């Protein structure tokens, strides 16, 4: 779902264009200003938490459960602005790397930091080595989706 599904959906079919309603009652000249937006590659960080100070830090699934957090990670996307005006300007293009929302990670999946650590390390993080994962953590409660 992350490695495929979310990327395909932001690429699939959402280009949006807007053409201003100018030159009313009087108009001529050359420009009713027009803008187009396009979305490129999606980026997904490791599960993070923002402390009230404003300082981000890595979140530990055990901590997420005690303090009652939502164990999720930030999702970022490439957004483009293209200004092919009605004449003079056409090559006005600018690249951006932007935060759009927070995707809940599922435990010990390829995007949840627990997948990489070894058995001794995982025991060091107060996490069970035998615990299977594959369930989301929301607001302190462990939640599993039924097929």
């Amino acid at each position: 779902f992350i490695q495929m599904s979310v990327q395909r959906i932001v690429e699939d079919a959402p280009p949006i264009d807007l053409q201003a309603e100018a030159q009313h009652a009087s108009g001529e000249v050359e420009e009713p200003p027009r803008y187009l937006l396009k979305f490129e590659q999606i980026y997904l960080s490791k599960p993070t938490h923002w402390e009230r100070d404003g300082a981000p830090s890595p979140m530990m699934p055990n901590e997420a459960r005690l303090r009652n957090l939502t164990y999720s990670a930030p999702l970022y996307v490439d957004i483009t602005k293209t200004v092919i005006k009605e004449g003079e300007e056409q090559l006005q293009t600018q690249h951006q790397k932007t935060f759009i929302g927070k995707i809940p990670i599922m435990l010990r999946s390829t995007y949840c930091l627990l997948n990489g650590l070894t058995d001794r390390d995982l025991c060091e993080l107060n996490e069970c080595p035998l615990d299977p994962g594959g369930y989301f953590i929301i607001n302190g409660s462990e939640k599993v989706l039924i097929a």
Partner: protein, 237 residues
């Protein structure tokens, strides 16, 4: 006021001829709908910098108080919401800069600052005075700086204010200059442009502030600090 209604039994629900089943719903609280619209803007602003719900709850509270007095009804409602957000953030002992709240908004720095004073006059209330410590944490954090270096910078900042080396300088700029001195005294060495980029201040302001604190650099570091480059080899710029 009242409950709502909405479409769905398949129909009969007249439109008899036109294409509008039964009837349209009705607005209720319009005089206040832009208060509700203010609450919507405060949460958007609030999430864009990852604030806690406790801040949002204080912010919403301040706003209702300012709204009920109707003492500053003429002002830009969005400017009022943004100023409330700034106050709530400072009262909870974790201030954001005027530069930061402006960033997540469409209101100008001057106008947020102006509204800030007016709200303070409207509620006949006061807040604490910002210190170096209240910002040293966030900045050093976003630059991926080690915990030890953050600690040193804090000490550098605190002492710098204690020795009164910067009577004609803002604490944020001094904070920035301490961060630079620390970073250049460690292996990390974040560039002036990068620090500039997190702090928001002009990199010429840091350079001047650094030039002002450089003559006393030996005395400002913690004696327990693990040095990488000695002060006798600390660069000048």
């Amino acid at each position: 006021l009242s409950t709502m209604i909405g479409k769905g039994t398949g129909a009969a629900s007249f439109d008899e001829f036109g294409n509008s089943k039964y009837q349209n719903r009705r607005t209720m609280s319009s005089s206040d709908r832009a208060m509700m619209n203010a609450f919507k803007e405060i949460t958007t602003m609030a999430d864009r910098i990852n604030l806690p719900r406790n801040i949002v709850d204080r912010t919403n509270n301040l706003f209702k108080q300012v709204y009920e007095q109707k003492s500053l009804k003429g002002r830009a409602n969005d400017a009022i919401a943004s100023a409330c957000l700034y106050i709530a953030c400072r009262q909870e002992g974790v201030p954001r800069t005027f530069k930061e709240i402006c960033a997540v908004s469409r209101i100008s720095k001057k106008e947020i600052g102006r509204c800030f004073k007016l709200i303070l006059k409207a509620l006949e209330t006061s807040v604490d005075l910002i210190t170096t410590g209240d910002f040293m944490s966030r900045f050093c954090s976003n630059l991926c700086l080690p915990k030890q270096v953050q600690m040193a910078a804090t000490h550098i900042a605190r002492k710098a204010v204690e020795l009164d080396l910067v009577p004609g300088r803002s604490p944020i700029s001094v904070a920035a200059a301490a961060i630079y001195m620390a970073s250049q005294a460690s292996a990390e060495k974040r560039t002036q442009k990068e620090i500039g980029d997190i702090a928001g201040v002009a990199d010429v302001t840091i350079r001047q502030s650094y030039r002002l604190i450089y003559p006393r650099a030996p005395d400002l570091f913690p004696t327990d600090f693990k040095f990488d480059t000695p002060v006798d080899k600390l660069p000048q710029l």
